[PDB]
Amino acid sequence: GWASETAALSETATPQIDRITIPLHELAAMPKASQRLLDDSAFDIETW
Amino acid sequence: ALNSAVAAE
Amino acid sequence: ALNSAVAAEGGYLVDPQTSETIRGVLRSTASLRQIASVVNVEATSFDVLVDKTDMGSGWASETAALSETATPQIDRITIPLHELAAMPKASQRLLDDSAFDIETWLANRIADKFARAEAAAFISGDGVDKPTGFLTKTKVANGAWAWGSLGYVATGAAGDFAAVNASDAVVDLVYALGAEYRANASFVMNSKTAGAVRKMKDADGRFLWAEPARLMGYPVLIAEDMPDIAANAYAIAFGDFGNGYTIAERPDLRVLRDPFSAKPHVLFYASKRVGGDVSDFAAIKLLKFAA
Known part of the structure; x- marks a missing residue:
């Protein structure tokens, strides 16, 4: 996400990898x- | 101070 | 490039100049630090060592066989x-x-x-987590004064000065403090007890007391943390705080910026550590308004 001048800023995502x-x-x-x-x-x- | 969004802070 | 008044016809070019340094409201800095004994200390605590008594002298005769004499007991x-x-x-x-x-x-x-x-802690602070102020130090009436207590003199009427004679409680508060402590002794009041003292006047309408705003030749610390004139309050204190109240502190302001917990923010954690209570119980007298 972008950002909010007043925000929690949670963990956004991470690529789930495939083999x-x-x-x-x-x-x-x-x-x-x-x-x-x-x-x-x-x-x-x-x-x- | 706090955030730059709301002006008074 | 027309007039600067309207914004559209060349009013956006004018870009108002901000201040050089960001100002602020200027609250009261009179904090008892300039009258007390500040000691630098890098430890958990500070132990003043005072003498609660005195020795004895002899006037030894020519053939007297002088025996022992007293030696003072010492309070930590x-x-x-x-x-x-x-x-x-x-x-x-x-x-x-x-x-x-x-x-x-x-x-x-x-x-x-x-x-x-820390001024409010120096004046009326309690035991827990903050310096114990001199007002919260188990007051005992003067004349019946022992070492574990602060003395007071009482004005008379309950919520005011004495009706018949005023400025007497103040003057025997001065002359009930000890001769050497009055060499550098100071009043401590707040800004609306000092007003009530300055409003006192004689029978003619002229106010009877003559930038530090000293009272009867002794300086006045205008605090903001002593109580005002209540029913049993201690609004005016007086004494040698340079010997009476020992502030112990670290002369640094430890700042740690914390970019990690509040993640879009910075969260400056700043903390100094400072302590202190009364060190010499004789060096401070108080004004009770009881009786």
Whole structure:
């Protein structure tokens, strides 16, 4: 508030804070590749 | 004295 | 830029000049401090050591075999040294915008009010929390005078001076006070007992008493705290207050500004501490109006 030349001047306010939690999940993919296919093909499927 | 609002004080 | 009389046509340019120092009403400063014994003391109390009796002398003969003689007994009177506090509340917006030095103005005014308020304690103050004045000191009629009391002489009629002869109670009040105490002794009255004394006159209409306004060659302290002429009042006192009344004090005016409790204000707390009662019971006589 402003002020009154004759006032109690009470405690006004204070920011009530909030905590936001970033949960930090994991992102995972597991593709299955055949041990035949990974060996006999000409293409580098392991890096593809 | 007291406050500056009311003149007589 | 026309005339200064009307405000609109150039009357706002004239900005009236304020005073140099903020004045005040000038109340009575006659406070018994200039007639009593002020002692600086940094303690809780003050103990005067008086002698309530005297020794003995011999006039020893040529062949006399002189024996013992008296040696006086000694009274300790304790000055309690109470404190006197005042705390006005002043606004910070005033103190920042109020070009007069408001802090030292309140300091002057608090010192004035303390010098005025300790006078009533010096004169008619009681025991608790303030100096015990000389009026509240268990008066015992003169002639039957012992050490633990103040003497008085009585005027006669109940609410006035004596009808047949006046100015006699005053003069045997003077000559019932002791020879050495009258070297520097003073009357203490107030401003409307002094008026009633000056209004007394002889049978012809001429007032019979002849800037300190002394009475019969003795100075007069115009107090404002002794009672006026009542039925059993003690309106006029007289004596050697420089030996009779001991004021004990600290000669400083302790000021603490308090910006925290009253938060938009400043709240100067100023307090000196001062005490005192009678020290020599023979040095003050009183005027009772009883009989």
